[PDB]
Scaffold this active site. Structure first.
Site, short mmCIF file in Angstrom:
data_model
loop_
_atom_site.label_atom_id
_atom_site.label_comp_id
_atom_site.label_asym_id
_atom_site.label_seq_id
_atom_site.Cartn_x
_atom_site.Cartn_y
_atom_site.Cartn_z
N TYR A 36 -18.28 -18.85 -70.78
CA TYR A 36 -18.77 -20.15 -71.15
C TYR A 36 -18.39 -20.46 -72.60
O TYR A 36 -17.69 -21.46 -72.85
CB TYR A 36 -20.30 -20.19 -70.95
N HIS A 163 -21.07 -46.60 -66.38
CA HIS A 163 -20.78 -46.76 -64.95
C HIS A 163 -19.37 -47.24 -64.51
O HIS A 163 -19.28 -48.03 -63.57
CB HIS A 163 -21.89 -47.65 -64.29
N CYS A 664 -37.02 -23.41 -40.38
CA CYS A 664 -36.43 -24.09 -41.53
C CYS A 664 -35.33 -24.95 -40.90
O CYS A 664 -34.43 -24.43 -40.22
CB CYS A 664 -35.84 -23.12 -42.55
N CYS A 998 -26.12 -42.41 -53.26
CA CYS A 998 -26.73 -41.11 -53.54
C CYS A 998 -26.27 -40.83 -54.96
O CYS A 998 -25.11 -41.03 -55.26
CB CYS A 998 -26.18 -40.02 -52.64
CU LIG Z 1 -26.29 -37.34 -51.58
CU LIG Z 2 -34.46 -22.71 -45.39
CU LIG Z 3 -24.94 -46.04 -59.91
CU LIG Z 4 -27.35 -44.23 -62.01
O LIG Z 5 -26.26 -45.39 -61.04
#
Ligand SMILES: [Cu+2]
Ligand SMILES: [Cu+2]
Ligand SMILES: [Cu+2]
Ligand SMILES: [Cu+2]
Ligand SMILES: [O]
Ligand SMILES: *[C@@H]1O[C@H](CO)[C@@H](O)[C@H](O)[C@H]1NC(C)=O
Ligand SMILES: *[C@@H]1O[C@H](CO)[C@@H](O)[C@H](O)[C@H]1NC(C)=O
Ligand SMILES: [Cu+2]
Ligand SMILES: [Cu+2]
Ligand SMILES: [Cu+2]
Ligand SMILES: [Cu+2]
Ligand SMILES: [O]
EC number: 1.16.3.4
Length: 1017
Positions: A36, A163, A664, A998
């Site tokens: 790192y 963005h 699960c 997302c």
């Molecule tokens: Cu996602």
């Molecule tokens: Cu799991």
């Molecule tokens: Cu966004």
């Molecule tokens: Cu965002």
């Molecule tokens: O975003």
């Protein structure tokens, strides 16, 4: 008020530091720092050029204001109480275009500062992309709609970031805090009654994404000549696990006094390896709404906590995700020193070694098949021979004993039979003191670290700095008596249950101790809630579940284990991919494939489940209690989500007799054997039944084989790129040479008119947005839904659904051409809980093959409502369709691939070419149908499912939502994982086309996004 802020975006060099000196024993596991932070031939070290927001005094971006040392590289703290008119004066003093998009506040398209095909025109696109040297002032409105919820704190945590291409702009360094307070919460730009206010961002700041990668390579690598950017280790060498940008105990400034009212604004940020577990070692930062000990954070998770700095001393903040912990994500902080609980609970525990067998019956209880059948789920984990250890592993774990005389154990009743590998329950009440007399007995030093109790520095069970046995170091034969306290400020809040599921593990070296076997349940309860035996007072059964992937390759006893069970050690390549898989024990409480016992109860019993977990970023679980539904924090749900160090207290009252599954849901885990059974017995004699189901509904559904297209139009994609100015090629969509395109055969649930199944119900406008999903079945509490289901596909499928009650536990598979009837009763416990919204959704799916059936297409929403401009309903399913698991893969290849013969189903590139990261079945703007009007009342039914990867932080640009009973909480990002079904209320206010996506890096670039339109009233 109308605040004005001057933000300039400058380029500069950031040093993740090393404070070039020590006094820093991070030593949780730690030393391979030089990857790192090592400068060199290839590696770049701890210096990267990275653009970043700075605060200037005047419109003359020359005079800067200095942001707190602890803030690290984040942007300047921007605050605003509700009703404010914040104007943000941005000036891009850097080599390329950036913007300033804020998260939780209102603005028009001319102030979004985000770029995408939103059908806007020039005057509204000035903000959407600022060039070098251009200046732009963003106008924002602190509306009452974005105001912190009626039950949120005074000031929630929000974020602002660039963005053009957010993942890259953010990796590059452009992101800062935006704290929103309610009406007059603030006072001298600080909360009315707080002492310290901090901002912390957990993130694996991945430098491989930053625009300045090249500029950093060409500069610092001594031999820039020969670095492979496409090299795993080079990439890893640029991933800076850090809290506020700082990476190995480097975070400075964190300082408070004892009895200090601290409020912490957290938020994660990152890609899909950003499964965090913030933990403030010293105290009880426990004021989310209830008492929390560890705080999970994912890409854009916005979280606020309240602490009262107590227990003076040099403490530690870390991320309990093991992998992150050893990649050095720690940060000292300190509470300067600027009654008790007499009831002593005394425990005597010895760590001992044993040969744990993960599955005694040696058979898959679920299928009654041999756990090592050739080529099967189980096989890999249990096959034994030359280079595969197999089923049982010499582990090492805690066991209770009668007295300091560590001579005789304590008999484990049938009650505690389910405990499996876990240690002995340690428990106590608020106002007590605990004294565990640990006595090591293994070949390594260990100790016991307790999450949840109040302990002084002499009892700390780990060692971080800045032969007697010490609390932190109890050597192989020594013994020690830890003393812990359970004072009010560490035990259950009024709004908390009677007992909090807790835990304890060996913290000499967490990243290795736990996996070997040192982890045990703990239970802290409100004062006087327990009987002499440690059992809650009106509770019939108390169970403890610990689902994890026991990583045997990381066991202290691994070598021994190779030596003992392999038929050729010397020959055992300890780093082979396949070797390490064979030893990744996906299990619950130590058991696998149905072998876990002791989960039995009586129907009508008041059962209380204590769940907890630990492990790395692969520990994203969805524990599904099939057949019944619990009640967590006032919300009816039947699938709990657990991550590294999460702990939950579920309350259930089983109501149907049978043997059901606790499993699960998250794929890998289920296939690998993370499934168990729990039994409900009939212990009474009860009624005769013609007295209650005020409603009856019946639907005719079928499962058809359709040709599905994940992205039928590529325009939006195309337009989005040209705006960003990206030379990108789509791996999932581009047919390429022999790859299978965007279309794949799938089997889906389509609704029909009647039992003849020859006339399908036409999908009207308000349902075009469902995409691949089946129909939105509706049922009110008290119904008796009847699904007439006909299988028109070519292989056994069925239909079942979460939360719903059934007659038995078995689910008959409908054969092809066959039509069957399933009946779901919707009693009270399948509907809104006490703090739930009125309608809550449950996913209905197919049971024949929990996994392949899903990825093949079979999924849909059942909305179950509680009571008797318009009101809208949308169902969104965020899921990365793993088209490689389709039952139809072989057809797709032959059908679609230009050259099937040239396809190798194991080729990593190919595998990925099939990971369709989509929303309701479609990626890249292709999800039509989301349209509302200003003023409407929208109900979004979000639900996630799928594998470990399925971390999905849903973000709605430009509008926030409210979420519990009465929209009591507010936020614009919602965390979603396998088995999460949630209902969000939202009132569109600003008109325009907005982006919905997302917030996790891989997912965005992959296409998990679309747009929702708010039409002018
Ligand atoms: Cu996602
Ligand atoms: Cu799991
Ligand atoms: Cu966004
Ligand atoms: Cu965002
Ligand atoms: O975003
Ligand atoms: C934008 O422009 C055209 C016609 O309006 C077409 O691409 C599409 O209908 C519009 N897109 C959206 C998201 O409204
Ligand atoms: C764009 O892609 C082409 C190949 O399609 C590649 O040769 C080129 O370097 C990329 N960038 C630019 C500016 O052309
Ligand atoms: Cu982490
Ligand atoms: Cu796995
Ligand atoms: Cu946003
Ligand atoms: Cu992916
Ligand atoms: O946003």
């Amino acid at each position: 008020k109308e605040k004005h802020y001057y933000i300039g975006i400058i380029e500069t060099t950031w040093d993740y530091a090393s404070d070039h000196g020590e006094k820093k024993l991070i030593s949780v596991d730690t030393e391979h720092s030089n990857i790192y932070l090592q400068n060199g031939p290839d590696r770049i070290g701890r210096l990267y050029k990275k653009a970043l927001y700075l605060q200037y005094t005047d419109e003359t971006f020359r005079t800067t204001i200095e942001k707190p040392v602890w803030l690290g590289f984040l942007g300047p703290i921007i605050k605003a109480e509700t009703g404010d008119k914040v104007y943000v004066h941005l000036k891009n003093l850097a080599s390329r275009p950036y913007t300033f998009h804020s998260h939780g506040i209102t603005y028009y398209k001319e102030h979004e500062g985000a770029i995408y095909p939103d059908n806007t025109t020039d005057f509204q696109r000035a903000d959407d992309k600022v060039y070098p040297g251009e200046q732009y002032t963003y106008m924002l409105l602190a509306t009452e709609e974005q105001s912190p919820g009626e039950g949120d704190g005074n000031c929630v945590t929000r974020i602002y970031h660039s963005h053009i291409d957010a993942p890259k702009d953010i990796a590059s360094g452009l992101i800062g805090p935006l704290i929103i307070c309610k009406k007059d919460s603030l006072d001298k730009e600080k909360e009315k009654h707080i002492d310290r206010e901090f901002v912390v961002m957990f993130s694996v700041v991945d430098e491989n994404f930053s625009w300045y990668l090249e500029d950093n390579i060409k500069t610092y690598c001594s031999e820039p000549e020969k670095v492979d950017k496409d090299n795993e280790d080079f990439q890893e060498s640029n991933r800076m696990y850090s809290v506020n940008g700082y990476t190995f105990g480097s975070l400075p400034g964190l300082s408070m006094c004892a009895e200090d009212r601290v409020k912490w604004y957290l938020f994660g940020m990152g890609n899909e390896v950003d499964v965090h577990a913030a933990f403030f070692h010293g105290q009880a930062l426990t004021n989310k709404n209830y008492r929390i000990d560890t705080i999970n954070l994912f890409p854009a998770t916005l979280f606020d906590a309240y602490m009262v700095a107590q227990n003076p001393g040099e403490w530690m903040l870390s991320c309990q995700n093991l992998n992150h912990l050893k990649a050095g994500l720690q940060a000292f902080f300190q509470v300067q020193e600027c009654i008790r609980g007499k009831h002593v609970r005394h425990y005597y525990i010895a760590a001992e070694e044993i040969i744990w067998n993960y599955a005694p019956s040696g058979i898959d209880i679920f299928t009654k098949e041999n756990l090592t059948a050739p080529g099967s789920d189980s096989a890999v984990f249990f096959e034994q021979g030359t280079t595969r250890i197999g089923g049982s592993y010499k582990k090492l774990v805690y066991r209770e004993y009668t007295d300091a005389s560590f001579t005789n154990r304590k008999e484990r009743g049938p009650e505690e039979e389910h405990l499996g590998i876990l240690g002995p329950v340690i428990w106590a009440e608020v106002g007590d003191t605990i004294r565990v007399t640990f006595h090591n007995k293994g070949a390594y030093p260990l100790s016991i670290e307790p999450i949840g109790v109040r302990f002084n520095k002499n009892n700390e069970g780990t060692y971080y700095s800045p032969v007697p046995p010490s609390a932190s170091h109890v050597a192989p034969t020594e013994t020690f008596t830890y003393e812990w306290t359970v004072p009010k400020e560490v035990g259950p809040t009024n709004a908390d249950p009677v007992c909090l599921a807790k835990m304890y593990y060996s913290a000499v070296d967490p990243t290795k101790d736990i996996f070997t076997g040192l982890i045990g349940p703990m239970k802290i309860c409100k004062k006087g809630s327990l009987h002499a035996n440690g059992r809650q007072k009106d509770v019939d059964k108390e169970f403890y579940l610990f689902p994890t992937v026991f990583d045997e390759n990381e066991s202290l006893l691994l070598e021994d284990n190779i030596r003992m069970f392999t038929t050729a050690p010397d020959q055992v390549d300890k780093e082979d991919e396949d070797f390490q898989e064979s030893n990744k024990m996906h299990s619950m409480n130590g058991f696998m494939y149905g072998n876990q016992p002791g989960l039995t109860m009586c129907k009508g019993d008041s059962v209380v489940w204590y769940l907890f977990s630990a492990g790395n970023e692969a520990d994203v679980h969805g524990i599904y209690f099939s057949g019944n539904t619990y009640l967590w924090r006032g919300e009816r749900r039947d699938t709990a989500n657990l991550f590294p160090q999460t702990s939950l207290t579920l309350h259930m009252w089983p109501d149907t007799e049978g043997t059901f599954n606790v499993e699960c849901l998250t794929t890998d885990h289920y296939t690998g054997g993370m499934k168990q059974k729990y039994t409900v017995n009939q212990c009474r004699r009860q009624s005769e039944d013609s007295t209650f189901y005020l409603g009856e509904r019946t639907y005719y559904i079928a499962a058809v084989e359709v040709e599905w297209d994940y992205s039928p139009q590529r325009e939006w994609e195309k337009e989005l790129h040209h705006l960003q100015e990206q030379n990108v090629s789509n791996a999932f969509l581009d047919k390429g040479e022999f790859y299978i395109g965007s279309k794949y055969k799938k089997v889906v649930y389509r609704q029909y008119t009647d039992s003849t199944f020859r006339v399908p119900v036409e999908r009207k406008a308000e349902e075009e947005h469902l995409g691949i999903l089946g129909p939105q079945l509706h049922a009110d509490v008290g119904d008796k839904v009847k699904i007439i289901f006909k299988n028109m596909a070519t292989r056994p499928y069925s239909i079942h659904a979460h939360g719903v009650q059934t007659e038995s536990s078995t689910v008959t598979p409908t054969l092809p051409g066959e039509t069957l009837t399933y009946v779901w009763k919707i009693p009270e416990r399948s509907g809104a809980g006490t703090e739930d919204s009125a309608c809550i959704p449950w996913a209905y799916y197919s049971t024949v093959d929990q996994v392949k059936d899903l990825y093949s297409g079979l999924i849909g929403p059942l909305i179950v409502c509680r009571r008797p401009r318009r009101k809208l309903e949308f169902a969104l399913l965020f899921l990365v369709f793993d088209e490689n698991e389709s039952w139809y893969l072989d057809d797709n290849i032959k059908t679609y691939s230009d050259h099937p013969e040239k396809v190798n189903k194991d080729d990593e590139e190919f595998i990925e070419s099939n990971k369709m990261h989509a929303i309701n079945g479609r990626m890249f703007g292709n999800l039509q149908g989301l349209t509302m009007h200003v003023g409407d009342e929208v109900n979004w039914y979000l639900m996630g499912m799928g594998n470990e990867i399925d971390l999905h932080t849903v973000h709605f640009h430009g509008h926030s939502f409210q979420y519990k009973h009465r929209g009591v909480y507010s936020s614009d990002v919602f965390d979603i994982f396998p088995g999460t079904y949630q209902t969000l209320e939202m009132f569109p206010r600003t008109p325009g086309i907005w982006l919905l996506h997302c917030h996790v890096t891989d997912h965005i670039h992959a296409g998990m996004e679309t747009t929702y339109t708010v039409l002018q009233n």
